[PDB]
Structures are given as C-alpha cells and as structure tokens.
Design a protein around this ligand. Structure first.
Ligand code: SAH
Lengths: 475, 916, 193, 96
DNA sequence: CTGAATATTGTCGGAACCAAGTCTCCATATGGAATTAATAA
DNA sequence: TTATTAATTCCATATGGAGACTTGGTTCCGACAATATTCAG
C-alpha cells in the first residue's frame, strides 16, 4: 500500500479535524493560486415544491440517474397510487423532493466515485423533480464549463472528501465548500469558450443521434426469430401470464422419465405446445449431441497470478464468448488441457437466474492463450452437418430457448436454477434445413455487428469529449 | 526411531527371561505358545511382540504367580479392514485357566497416536464374542504399555474389568472406564475402579504425547454435537464449563482425597446421572467462587454447570469420564516440548463455535501486526534488561484471549528462543530469566502477573479463562465482569492486583486514573448501546459520559489505564477518523496522546462477519510535562480568540449593519473607527480568519470583506457547544494554532490486502501488504533434517530391497514351471520388473533432490544457521524452495522482522516511528 | 363444552390440538404463545418429531400420539392413524441427530437415506387417518430433480394429490429466499392402496 | 399455567440467569413492557406472532441455516388452513 | 410583559448497513469402471 | 474347460446446494432547531 508522512498541523485543514488516510492522500502544500467555492458556484438550499395532482409529475432517485449524466425518471401520478410504487409516494410525502431551478448542477452526495453529476440544461422543457440526496449548486461562471470541469476534471478531489463512517461514502455541503479548485485549470477553460462549447455541443448531438437508433442485443435476436416461424410475440407474452394449469394424472409420465409434476414443468408443456402449433421441423436435440463435458472451477483470486478462468458474466445474448477473463488460479488438476476453451466450441451457461440460464455462445475468437471455462459451462461438441452451432446458440438465446430453460431449470434455490444434460438431451427444438439456418445467422450477425459499431462510435466520441477538455485545461 | 523403542529393544537383547534373544522365531523357547499364525508368517511382527515379550518377562520375573507353561487359547475372528482378521487378542496370560479369563492388549507409546478404537478392539467388544462362542467367563482386561518411566518402567495402562458393564456400548457410555492402572501380582486388583487418587497408583496420567488430542477432538465433536435441536455455541459453552469444573477439581484437591471428576462405579453398578450431576455442579458452583471472582451467593447458587434439557445426561457422563486420564493443568507435555492442550482447544474452537456475527474475533494476522507494530518484543527485552520486569499488557475488551494468547506466545518465542541474544546475562537479570522462562513445563508462568483482561460476556470470559489455563497460566487475572467500571470492582483474591488502584488526576477532569499498565491492545465493540441505568452509573468517571457514543468511552478508559509513556494499539473504526460528530474524541486523543501511526485496513478484514471499515490507531500517552504545555497553549490561544471574536463582532455590527457607535464596545474597538486606521482593523480581520483569507482579498474594502466572508464569520464565532473540557473557545482555531506550534511528523499508511479473504465457505490465501512471512526457518539443524532425508531414503530402499527379493524369488521359478503356471509366473515377473523401473524412476529423482537440498543448505544455511546476507530472506530463490518440495514440511510460520530494507507496511513501521 | 364460555373458550385445545418441536427454547416459546391465545400448551411435545411414537410421553388421560401398530400395506411399521389435518413446514436438508439415526433404519420405508425433508412426508403418512388431509410446504427440489423420484412415487402410492401451488421467492426474503410450494394431498384408503 | 406439578423444578428454575443476563438489562426490559398489554391487546395485532418474529429478528441467519429455523409467514398459514377446507371439515365433524 | 424553557412541531445525520442483481466453488453420490468371481461346457 | 458375474473397490464425472459474494444508495431512528409553552416574576 501507500506510505506517506504528514504533520500535526495538517489536521487543522478541516474544522472537523479528520485525520483519515483517504482525505489526506490528496492533502499537500499548494503553490497554485487556487480558487474557492465563493467565486465559482453557490449552494442553493432545497425546498419542497407544491406538486399538483392532476398532472403526472416525473421523479428520479440516484439509481435512475446514469453514470454518464443521463436521467431516466419514473412517471408517477397521485391518481393511480398502487402498492408497487407506494414507497416512492411515501418518500414524496415525507419531503424528499425538490424541483431544480434551470441552469443548476445536481451532484449526488452518496458514492461520488461513480461520477453521477447531472446538469439541468438552460434550454428544453418538462422539468423533473429530484431526490434531496443530490446537492444543488448555482454556477456563477458558465454552467456547462463548470459541469464539464466537475465531471472530467476534479473527479478525484471530490472523491477525496467523501466521508464513509461505518457505511455509505457520502458528501456534505461543507465538503464542497472546502474544495480547492485550481485557477489555471478553470481560467483556461473559461477563456477558451465560444468554441469549447460549440465542439462539445456538436459531439453531444452526434452522440444523441447515435443513441436514437440503438437497440438491445436481445430484441434483435427476438425480431428475426419472430419474423420467421410466424410467431405472435404479443400472444406469447399473454399466455405466459396465465397462472392456472389443470393437467390430469395420466399426463404426468408423458416424456417425463423421472416423474416431474411441478407447476413449472406443466406450464413448460403448455408453452411448448403453443409455440409449435404451426412449425413442423422439430426433432429432439438428444439425437444430434456427441458430448456434454462440463468445466472446472478451482479457488480463484480476482486478478491473480495464474491461468485465467471465465465467468457467467462473459456469455452475452449475441452468441460470442466475451473472452474477458477476470479470475485467475494457480491450481492444477493433471488434466488441464481438457478444460481449455478452443475456437468453435459451444458453451451453454449452467446455473444463473431463471431468465439467464441456458445462454449459449460460440467462441469465434482466435486466442492463443489458455483460458479455463468453469463447471458452470457445458461444452457441446455436436454434429456439424445439421445444427450449425451458431444457429443453435442464437436459438437458445432467443425466446425459443429463453422460455424452455425458464421452466425446465431444476433447483431448490431459485437464484441458482441449473440445467442438466437430461434437459439438453430431451429438448425439442425446431431444425430448419441447413440453407435456411444460414439465412437467420447472417441477419442477426450483420444487424448486431452494426449495433456494436454504434456502441463503439459513441464510446470514442465520449472519450474524445474529455480528451478535448483535458488538452484545453492543460495548455 | 522412537524414544521408547531404543530402551525396549535394549531389553529385548538383554532379556532377564531369555525369550526374545532368538530373532524372527521363538518356537524353541518357553512361554511361546500362541497357536502359530492363521493368515501369514510366524516371525517378527512389529511393535506388538517388542513390548509383549517384556510384559511376559514381568509376568514371570516379578509377578511370578507360579511359572506353569503359559498355555493360552486359540484365535477368534474379526472382520477388521480388508479380509477377515484372526487375532489372538494380542498377548495372553495363561488365560488363567483353560477357557479365556484374562485378556491383554499390548500397545506402544507411539501406537497411541495412530489408532484409538483399539482401546477396546480386542477388549469388551470381542470379550462378549468369546463369552458367546466358547462360553467363557472373561473378567479382566488390560490396555498394557510401558513407556520409559525410570527403572520401575511403570505401566501407564488402562486396565478394566468385565463385571460392571454387560456390553461395550454401555462401557463407552461410561466414558472409557479403567478398573486398574498397574498390574498386580497374586491375581488381585480391586473389582471397581481404583479411582483417581492423586498421589500414586492411577496418578493423573500426565504424559499427553501426540494425536490422542486429535482422537478426543474427533470423538467429542462426533458425539456431543451430534444433531437434534441446539445452536452449537451453548454446547461449546457447556463443554467449557465442564473443563472449568475439571480445572477447579485439580486446583482444590491435595495428596490423596481422590478426585470428584469421576464416575464412582460403586461395585459394578454405574453412577446414576443425578448424583454425578450434583457432584460436577458442586465442583462448578465452587469454581465460580475461586476462579470467576463472584461473591453473590444467590447468583452462585441459582445456576448449574449444564442446562440439562439442552444437554442430555448421557452426554454429560461421557464427557466427564472421557476428559479425565489427562491433566488439564500439567498434562501438556507433547511427548517432549509441552503445549499440547492449547491446540486441542483451538481445534475445539474452530470446529463448532459458529462465529456468526455477534461474536467474531480479530483475525490472527491483524493481532500479530498490532503486536509487532508496537515493538512489543523490543519493549519486553528492554524492560527485562534494565528494570528486571516485563510489560503489563491489558485488554479491556478481551474476548477469547485472542490478544492475550498471541502476546504470550510472542514474548515467550522472542525473549527465550529467537532474540535471547539481545538479553545479556547480568546475574539478577539471569535470576529473573530462570525465574520466569527456564522451566519448560511451566514456561508460561511469567504472565501470571502481567496479562490482564476484562470480558463482559460470561461465556466468553469462561472460554478465555479456559484458553488461558490450557496453555498454562494464572487465568485469574481475567475479570468476567464489565470493563467500564471503577477500579475498585476488579478484586483478585490472590497476587498483587494492579487493576484495583485508583487516584484522581490533576489535569484530567479530576477523575480516577490507574496509570500502571504499559501496553493496551484491544478491539473495542463497533457499536455498543449500553442502557439507561448503566449509562447513568458511568457518566461520572468519564469526561464525555453524557454523550451517547459509549464506543468512544473505551479510548478514555485506555487513557485511564495507560501510565505516562505507555503504548496503545486499537482497531477503531473509521468513524473516529472521519465523521464530524466524533470531533471531541479526536481532540481528546490529540490532547492526551502523541499519535504516532495509523494504518487504513481494507474493507475485507472482517468480510464474512461485518463490512465496517476499520483503521488501526497507535499512540503513546503524553507525560504531564507536555499536557501542562498543551493546557497553557489552549488558554494563550483561547483568550486571543475571545478578544478577536469580540472585536470582529463589533466590526461587523458597525461597518456592515451600520449600527450606531457605542462607547461601551471596547477601548480598542472604538479607537480607530473615527480615525479610520484600516490596517489595524485589517490585521484583526485577517487574524480571526486564520485559514479563510486569500491574497486577492487584501485589496477589498472593509465593508466588503465582512460581507464576502459572512455566513462564515459566525461559524468561526462559536464555542465548543456542550463541553467543559475545551472551554468557551472555538477548538478549531485554537487547535490550528497549537498544532502549528506543537507539530510533529506522523506515520500514515494503508493496506489493500491483508493476506486472507474469509467467506461463508472457508477462506483463501491472498497477497499480503501488512507483513511478510519467514518461510525459510532461521535455524535448522542440518544433522536432524539430513537424517530425516536419509530416513526417507532408507524407507524407500526397504521397498526396493523387497522388490528385489520377489525378483530373486521369481527368477528361479521360470525353469520350475514349463508352460501353464510358467505363463502366470512370467506375467507376475514382468509386472514386478515394471514396478522396478517405477521404483528406480523414483530413486533417481530422490537422489537428485537430495543433492539439490544439500546444495541449498551449503549455499544458504552454512551451518545450522542462516547467513547474514540471507537473514533478511529477501531472495526469491531461497524462499520458493521451502514453498515446494519436502522442505514445506518444516517451513517457518513466523513473521519476518526485517530491519535492513522495506518491503511491507510492518517493515517501515519498525524502522520509522520512534517510541520514546 | 367447547364453544360457550367466553372467558376461556379454547378448552378443546388441550385435547384436540397437538404439536412437536425439537428445540426447548422454541417449545417454551410455543407454549407461551398457546397460553397467550387461551391456553392449550399441554400437547406441545419438546421431543424430536421423527422418534418412535411410544416416546411421546405426556401427563394426561388422552394421549392419541401414542398408539402405534405395524401396518399391512406399509412394510410392517408403526402407523399412528388418528390425526386428520396434518400441517407443517419441514426443515429442508437438516442433519438428523446421531441417536435418532438408530431408529431411522427401521420404522421407515426409505429410512436408509439421510434426507430430512423427505422423511417427514413418510411420518405424515404415519400420522394421517385413512382419509385425513395434508397441507405441507415443500422445496421445489422435491417436485423436481431426479434423486427425489422415490418420494414422488411414494406420495403417488399412498396419498392422493389434490393441489400444488408454487410460492414466489419473495416469501422468505430476508432469511433464505428459496423457491417453495404448497402441496395438498389426501391419504388413500386401504381399499385404494 | 404450564401445569408444572413438580415442586422441585420450580424451586430451582428461574425467570432469567442473573449471571448470563445482567439485572440492569432486566430492569430495562421490564420498563419497556410496563405499559404494554399482551393480553386483551392481541385482538388489534391480528396476524402478528410476536415470539416467532422476535426469534427471527434476534437469532442470526447463520444459526438458522444448519437447522430449518424458518417460520412460515402468517398469510401463508391462513391460506393453508382455508385451502384444506378446515372450517368445513371441523363443522362436519362436529355435526356428525 | 419579558422571558426561556417544554410541551412539540418538522428537518439533518449518521448507520455493529442492506437490498438488487446475478454470479459460485464444493461436498457427495455414482456408476461404470475396475476387481473377484462362479458358470458348465 | 474357462470366464460371467456381481460384489468390492475406485476412479473422474454429473448433480445440486433453506447459497452467497458484488455493487451501489437506500430507509429510518435520533437528534434538533424551531415550533410552541408557560407561569412568573
Ligand atoms: N465494557 C464492555 N462493553 C461492551 N463489550 C465489552 C465490554 N468489555 C468487554 N467487551 C467484549 O468485547 C468484545 C468485542 S469483540 C472482542 C475483540 C476481538 N473480537 C477479540 O476477540 O479480541 C465483545 O464480545 C464483548 O463481550
């Protein structure tokens, strides 16, 4: 760890005479002609607004605000106050609400390192109320300049005054009033304005345009799979909401082989019967399976010194292994080679939530190093003449595999529902001809590749939007 | 080559009966009728005959009882292990008469280690089988062995009769009873047990050697815990109370007088559970009067050792009767080296305590880091080398004695073995050294006068006392009462009571101060709530007793306990360091302590129990000659602050608010308003804002300065609220001035990984930032370790010679058989040859690793030591060899106290901050 | 005699309401609750729930939880067929006591498997009358998984399953959050087995 | 109320262990429950098992894991009895 | 008739923290292997 | 006339766990100022 050395006098920096390590990691003699909170901003005391009842107002907690300074408020109305959102209305009635005045900045008080600072823009409409967990400041200088100087720069001095105290690392208005902002950093940004606002505005509107067409990695798989097979997605989500199945005693042993009569199995049967009403290409998977080798999960330390190991978070709805190992072991089992990922392998997740169990992916990434797949991965070397593994993985990630594994995953603990080899061998999935399987794969490969390219341009723009600020400040 | 083996072999080749001189056979000498054998071989059969021959000699030499011919019975059947076993119930003594009447099982001092189910394996369990097959009347059963005990070589045996318990299950319920200790001539012995008369005969069986600790630990856990409905902890506490009762029984009893920790099998009938409970409870209810220092007759009489309905009586009988046959006071011998019952208790603690969250322990790495960061070994050496005295380590929060046992082992291993070079023999120093350390069987006797602790929990206090006694020490110094009481309450009924004196202090609230201890290591509770009556009873002995932050009261108690110049090490949470509310406690610490070190521990130290962040705090209590200076400064900069407050208030009233001039303000306030004198007012307004002003404000008008700095003038114009200690002055201004005048460097460090990561499913090694282990031991006996390698060499060479023996046996069978059996002989010979290449591929690697180990010792260890250029153990090549291979067997689980360079937090703490 | 004295109306409780608990503290708390709600803390046995029926000694005239005789179509094992409304929440995968392990190899059909949550189903069968009702809370692993086939087969032989409803994981949110389900079955008469 | 007929157990048993349980803590506990009406007050607090909820809140989950110390919530229990038609069964048994 | 001190009226400040989301090593059968084995020409 | 079991070892493997670690931020009690109070000199 760090080894510093400070003096007694340095305990006089704050009237709270704190002497914690985190606060004084930043404390040091200063030569820059620092500014203070008086010149830059002004803390605005919070007040409880008089909300009307007819108009549905919009509320936002800390969790609704994103890391990149976006708000996703919840539309609440006193007219429809049910028990699901009763807690929010309880907070509102208690008095944890305030309407930000236009142009202010709202810094979150809890956990500053997430950089959850939001700016109320001077333009636009439909103002949104916020939880008093934020802190209002009125920037005497240009609001956008202070906003960008607080998000990108000064992100470590704000994090150097947070108070943990047997729990949440939180801030206080006094902590902000204690900050020691520099002069050159702020005056360089303020003087070089009228272009450092135009460039950032253009880049932000480009980012907004890119986000305007973004789609999730699951809807794309759902869209094309719904395009084929002529599946009414609206009716499927309606039959899934039914909570009443009345089967008979005779229809318990049909294709059971182990006498399972739980409600989940009996609703699986109904859903699978509904899904295949018009599709006639279905054959059991157990025919086209050659092996079901599991993985190896030794005791692993995060960021250790040894062979890397994958995790359940590296399987995405796309169908490609993320190959982003985090955990590392140093233990051997005399059979290391059999538990190393190879190009073309088909891995299915074994053990997750009821909605994320059974996700499959093909490696499709040439990596020369050896990476262990945990025992929560089932590798499925199969017959490469009818299945076309990519198609199988993307079928499993689709609603055709997200509903079967949602109701066949055995387990007492619903948080780690697991699938066994028997479910894989007894799964009746639709197999179209090899030519027909290739067409879908091309579609939900090109569309998702375009989506990923969208996901890459936005990151590059958001990185240069702060590189510009850094180079402007330090100049 | 075991200790007993050499003497017993010497008497095998020096038999007074002349029965074992002929090796590998005895068929041509008298008293060798054992129905040959039934499975394989009639020759040397290990340790069994080695001691059974001497037993036969003793039977004939001194026991006599006429010579006859030692005509014994035949072998029965046992289904033990692979294939049925046909044993001759070890050795036999004439079976008295034709039918089996006497059974003896010869064992060995080292054989008590491997197996403990053979105490009755050929005894009771098969005794009924003999009585049911041959219809005999077996009555007398011997668990015979003679270890090394002087010329008399007295048998430390467990001899039992077969008239008390019809079956062996009831005998086990009778807790491994023994109706005989020493073999008696003339066919005598009492029918019932000879009891536990503590003079001679049975004694107390004080030679606990090895692995019977593990046998008992597995036995107690598999029976007492069991299942059903309980919650582990109370079972553990009941066992602790039983051990406490046994310790009290050993304390109170004298020569003879038997022992109350028995079963008292009157004749043949076993004890009724009620009377045994009454006896054990009387032992326990008198233990409290003598050990727990309780005086309330009502409390000491309205209780019991076990809760009955949550602890069945059969379990009580089994425990109370199995726990004997080993002294809990002096029984620790570990064959040779002592300290064997401690490891037993930490085996018990680990398996069954269920730490949960309410009762967790400071992890041992943290405790050792705290002890070394205080330079406890150096302080102890200096105190012994100059004052002929040891420190007075205390623990006001105590617990399981975690902070005390570690300190005990630390001092013993650092002043006696590792750093005794620092101790110089100067007669009186040597006198103290032999008075406190030299007796190995009572090496932990110094800490009968130095270690102290206070545990509020009754069960935790009892467990701490039991841990304290088992290692061997005067646990009477731990008080099971509260730790936040006046010193008069801590009454020890023997020895000097350092935690009893009290006296009001001049410059501390005119309150009691013990001021006798030197080191105060503790881990205060994270959030204690106390209660109304308790809070009212304690808000007179502490300055900040009114404030309901009782956790902070411990620091005040730490000041009250430490003498002038003592050392303090704590595990205080971050709230002391960061939270605004706990501002008074920081000022108190700065006033009465010289803060010398602080380590920001990571958020994973107590991860399975609680995620609250903590930071170790180290300090040295200031002497009075510095507290007086602090008090003088606090007034010199307090009067100035008050005057400045008055002047600034007047200036704000006039210049800003425009109030009419009043001549009654002050002679210096209304002296320059008419004359202007802006600079004089400017100096005052700057000085009042000692750290708020900026250079750019040096040009603003007087009115603007008091307006710009408004909403802050009032903030720096308030006293210290409800506090009569700091006075009616803003501490922040006064403290800022005092710290400027009284400034000293302070160590500052943080740790991101302590070395462990405990979870609900065990723990796992992690990188360590606090300290570094030693791995390679400092001193390793080259002859001893090389003898261990040579022992493994010849152990494998024995298998090599055996395989060569079958090779020679079968190399002549090829010509003996032509085709049919020849094919099988050839196949067996081929696989024997394959085993030969396997064993030679073992042997060549064995030789290569012998050579590399010898190279390691020569290039690193010189001669039974470690070279000065490698003593720091910073070389990666030296370390890793001990981390792998067979050297990992020895290793060294000791913290490396490097003082040449810095590589871990502990290194620069011992090389940085100086304790004066 | 049962429902008329307003002051003390819970008189039938002593003679028409039984219960077993293995923890003495829990037993005392349960008895305190019974006397809080109008007495009835006479049949709360503080002994184990899977012990032989002859062990449940009580100091009163009616001791219905004592009768036990071998049953023809059960493997000749003790059956106390008098109770009707058997309801409980078995401990899931709890370790049986070593002393009780002696008496589980006998008097139980599948008594060779140390599985607590499945042994109590058999004990219920030993307790319901020939026509009694059984509403129990069981883990979803009983109704699923391949290692529990015998119990599911065992239930379908002697019992006549009437309903099963899967509770949400929000049931035991602070404590364990395990997927459980309520099973409602009625014992079949000997003329049906 | 518990019908303990033996006069010896009553002479040796106790409400609390004054050594395990400090007496000032007993004072506080009595003070907290002085005004409370456990009897005749249970009607208002319908569907609230005080003693069981106290066990759940006090005993750690670590001890409630080895043994199945997980109490069924009251809403479920009222559903189990009403789903079994226990009311109708009791009425029929009383009638016939 | 000028209080300040206790009914309380709504607001800060922390917390032996703690829900939400979702990712995990390991004890334990187990059976198909091995083994011994008895079929029987 | 052997070599088929079917038991008794023994392996790496499949299965499942009243789970359990990670990350982020939430309620609620306790002060507490400021309501009010509050009786009195
Ligand atoms: N005056 C007091 N007030 C509260 N707890 C006290 C106390 N005096 C001693 N203790 C004990 O201090 C313990 C805090 S945890 C003990 C420190 C650490 N776990 C160790 O074993 O060394 C509690 O279990 C409590 O029983």
């Amino acid at each position: 760890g760090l080894i510093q050395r400070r003096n007694f006098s340095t305990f006089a920096s704050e009237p709270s005479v704190r002497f914690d390590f985190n606060y004084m990691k930043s404390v040091t003699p200063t030569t820059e002609e620092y500014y203070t909170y008086k010149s830059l901003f002004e803390v605005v005391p919070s007040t409880v607004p008089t909300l009307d009842e007819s108009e549905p107002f919009k509320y936002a907690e800390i969790g609704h605000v994103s890391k990149n300074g976006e708000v996703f408020p919840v539309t609440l109305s006193f007219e429809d106050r049910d028990e699901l959102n009763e807690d929010l209305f309880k907070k509102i009635e208690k008095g944890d609400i305030f309407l930000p005045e236009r142009g202010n900045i709202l810094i979150s008080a809890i956990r500053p390192y997430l950089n959850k600072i939001v700016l109320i823009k001077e333009d636009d409409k439909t103002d949104i109320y916020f939880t008093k967990a934020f802190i209002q400041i009125k920037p005497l200088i240009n609001s956008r300049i202070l906003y960008y100087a607080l998000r990108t720069i000064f992100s470590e001095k704000i994090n150097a005054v947070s108070r943990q105290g047997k729990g949440y690392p939180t801030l206080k208005e006094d902590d902000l009033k204690t900050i020691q902002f520099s002069k050159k950093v702020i005056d360089n940004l303020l003087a070089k304005e009228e272009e450092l606002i135009s460039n950032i505005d253009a880049l932000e509107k480009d980012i907004k345009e890119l986000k305007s067409i973004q789609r999730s990695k699951k809807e794309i798989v759902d869209e094309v799979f719904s395009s084929h097979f002529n599946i009414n997605m609206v009716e499927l989500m309606a039959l899934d909401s039914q909570r009443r199945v009345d089967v008979g005693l005779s229809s318990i042993s049909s294709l059971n082989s182990t006498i399972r009569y739980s409600y989940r199995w009996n609703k699986m049967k109904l859903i699978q019967k509904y899904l295949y009403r018009d599709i006639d290409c279905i054959e059991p998977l157990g025919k086209y399976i050659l092996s079901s080798n599991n993985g190896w999960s030794p005791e692993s330390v995060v960021g250790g010194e040894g062979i890397p190991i994958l995790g359940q978070e590296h399987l995405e709805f796309d169908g490609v292994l993320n190959v982003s190992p985090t955990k590392a072991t140093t233990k051997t089992k005399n059979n290391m080679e059999n538990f190393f990922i190879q190009e073309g392998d088909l891995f299915i997740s074994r053990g997750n939530t009821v909605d994320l169990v059974g996700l499959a992916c093909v490696v499709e990434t040439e990596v020369t190093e050896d990476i262990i797949y945990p025992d929560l991965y089932i590798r499925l070397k199969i017959d490469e003449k009818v299945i076309h593994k990519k198609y199988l993985a993307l079928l499993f990630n689709s609603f055709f595999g997200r509903l079967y594994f949602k109701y066949v995953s055995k387990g007492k603990n619903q948080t780690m529902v697991k699938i066994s080899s028997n479910e894989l061998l007894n799964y009746y999935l639709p197999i179209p001809p090899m030519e027909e399987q290739l067409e879908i794969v091309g579609k939900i490969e090109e569309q998702i590749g375009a989506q990923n390219e969208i996901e890459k341009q936005i990151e590059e723009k958001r990185n240069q939007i702060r590189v510009i600020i850094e180079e402007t400040a330090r100049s | 080559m075991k200790n007993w083996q050499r003497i017993v072999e010497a008497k095998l080749e020096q038999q007074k009966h002349k029965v074992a001189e002929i090796s590998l056979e005895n068929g041509t000498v008298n008293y060798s009728k054992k129905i040959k054998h039934n499975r394989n071989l009639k020759a040397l059969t290990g340790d069994e005959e080695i001691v059974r021959a001497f037993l036969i000699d003793r039977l004939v030499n001194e026991l006599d009882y006429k010579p006859e011919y030692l005509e014994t019975e035949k072998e029965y059947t046992i289904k033990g292990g692979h294939s049925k076993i046909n044993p001759r119930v070890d050795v036999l003594v004439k079976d008295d008469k034709g039918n089996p009447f006497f059974f003896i099982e010869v064992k060995a001092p080292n054989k008590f280690e491997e197996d403990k189910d053979e105490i009755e394996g050929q005894l009771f369990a098969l005794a009924q089988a003999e009585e049911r097959d041959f219809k005999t009347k077996v009555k007398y059963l011997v668990y015979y062995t003679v270890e090394l005990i002087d010329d008399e070589i007295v048998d430390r045996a467990i001899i039992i009769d077969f008239e008390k318990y019809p079956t062996y299950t009831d005998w086990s319920n009778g807790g491994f009873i023994s109706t005989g200790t020493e073999l008696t001539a003339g066919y005598g012995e009492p029918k019932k047990q000879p009891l536990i008369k503590g003079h001679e005969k049975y004694d107390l069986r004080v030679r606990i050697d090895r692995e019977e600790i593990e046998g008992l630990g597995r036995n107690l856990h598999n029976v007492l815990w069991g299942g059903g409905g309980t919650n582990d902890s109370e079972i553990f506490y009941s066992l602790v109370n039983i051990i406490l009762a046994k310790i009290q029984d050993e304390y109170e009893k004298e020569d003879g007088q038997e022992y109350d920790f028995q079963v008292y099998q009157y004749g043949d009938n076993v004890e009724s559970p009620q009377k045994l409970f009454d006896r054990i409870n009387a032992l326990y209810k008198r233990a409290l009067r003598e050990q727990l220092n309780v005086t309330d007759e009502q409390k000491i009489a309205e209780d019991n050792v076990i809760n009955r309905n949550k602890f069945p009586l059969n379990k009580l009988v089994y425990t109370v009767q199995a726990l004997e046959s080993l002294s809990f006071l002096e029984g620790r011998n570990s064959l040779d080296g002592k300290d064997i019952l401690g490891d037993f208790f930490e085996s018990i603690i680990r398996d069954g305590f269920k730490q949960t969250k309410g009762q967790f322990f400071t992890p041992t790495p943290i405790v050792k880091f705290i002890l070394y960061a205080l330079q406890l070994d150096k302080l102890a050496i200096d105190r012994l080398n100059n004052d002929r005295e040891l420190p007075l380590i205390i623990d006001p929060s105590a617990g399981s004695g975690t902070f005390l046992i570690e300190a005990m082992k630390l001092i013993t291993k650092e002043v006696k073995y590792k750093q005794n070079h620092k101790v110089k023999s100067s007669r009186q120093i040597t006198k103290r050294f032999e008075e406190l350390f030299m007796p190995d069987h009572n090496e932990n006797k110094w800490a009968r006068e130095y270690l102290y602790g206070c545990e509020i929990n009754f069960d935790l206090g009892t467990a701490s006392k039991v841990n304290m006694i088992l290692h061997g020490d005067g646990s009477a110094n731990i008080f099971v009462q509260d730790g936040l009481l006046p010193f008069r309450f801590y009454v020890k009924e023997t020895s000097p009571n350092y935690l009893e004196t009290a006296s009001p202090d001049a410059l501390y609230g005119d309150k009691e101060v013990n001021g006798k201890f030197d080191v105060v290591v503790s881990n205060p509770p994270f959030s204690v709530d106390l209660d109304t009556q308790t809070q009212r009873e304690v808000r007179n002995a502490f300055l900040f007793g009114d404030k309901k932050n009782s956790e902070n009261l411990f620091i005040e108690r730490y000041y009250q306990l430490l003498k002038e110049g003592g050392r303090l090490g704590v595990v205080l949470p971050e709230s002391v360091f960061d939270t605004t509310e706990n501002k008074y406690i920081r000022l108190f610490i700065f006033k009465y302590f010289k803060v010398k070190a602080v380590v920001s521990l990571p958020q994973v130290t107590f991860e399975p129990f609680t995620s609250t962040k903590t930071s170790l705090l180290f300090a040295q209590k200031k002497t009075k000659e510095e507290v007086e200076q602090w008090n003088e400064l606090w007034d010199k900069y307090g009067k100035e602050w008050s005057l400045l407050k008055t002047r600034i208030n007047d200036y704000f009233s006039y210049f800003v608010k425009g109030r009419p001039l009043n001549k009654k303000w002050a002679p210096d306030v209304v002296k320059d308003i008419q004359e202007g004198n802006e600079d004089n007012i400017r100096k005052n307004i700057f000085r009042f804002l000692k750290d708020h002003i900026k250079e750019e404000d040096k040009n603003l008008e007087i009115k603007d300065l008091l307006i710009k700095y408004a909403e802050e003038i009032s903030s720096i114009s308030k006293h210290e609220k409800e506090t009569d200690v700091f006075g009616f002055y803003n501490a922040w201004w006064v403290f800022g001035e005092v710290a400027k005048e009284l400034d000293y460097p302070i160590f500052m460090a943080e740790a991101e990984n302590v070395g462990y990561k405990r979870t609900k499913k065990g723990e796992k090694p992690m990188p360590n930032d606090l300290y570094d282990l030693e791995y390679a031991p400092s001193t390793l006996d080259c002859e001893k370790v090389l003898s261990s390698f040579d022992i493994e060499i010849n152990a494998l060479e024995a298998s090599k010679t055996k395989l060569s023996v079958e090779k020679g046996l079968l190399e002549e069978k090829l010509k003996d058989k032509e085709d049919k059996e020849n094919e099988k002989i050839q196949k067996r010979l081929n696989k024997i040859s394959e085993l030969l290449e396997t064993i030679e591929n073992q042997l060549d690697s064995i030789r290569s690793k012998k050579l590399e180990v010898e190279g390691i010792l020569e290039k690193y260890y010189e001669n039974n030591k470690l070279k000065e250029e490698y003593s720091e153990r910073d070389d990666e090549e030296l370390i890793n060899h001990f981390k792998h291979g067979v050297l990992y067997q020895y290793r060294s689980e000791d913290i490396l106290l490097r003082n040449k360079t810095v590589h871990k937090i502990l290194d620069e703490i011992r090389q940085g901050v100086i304790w004066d």
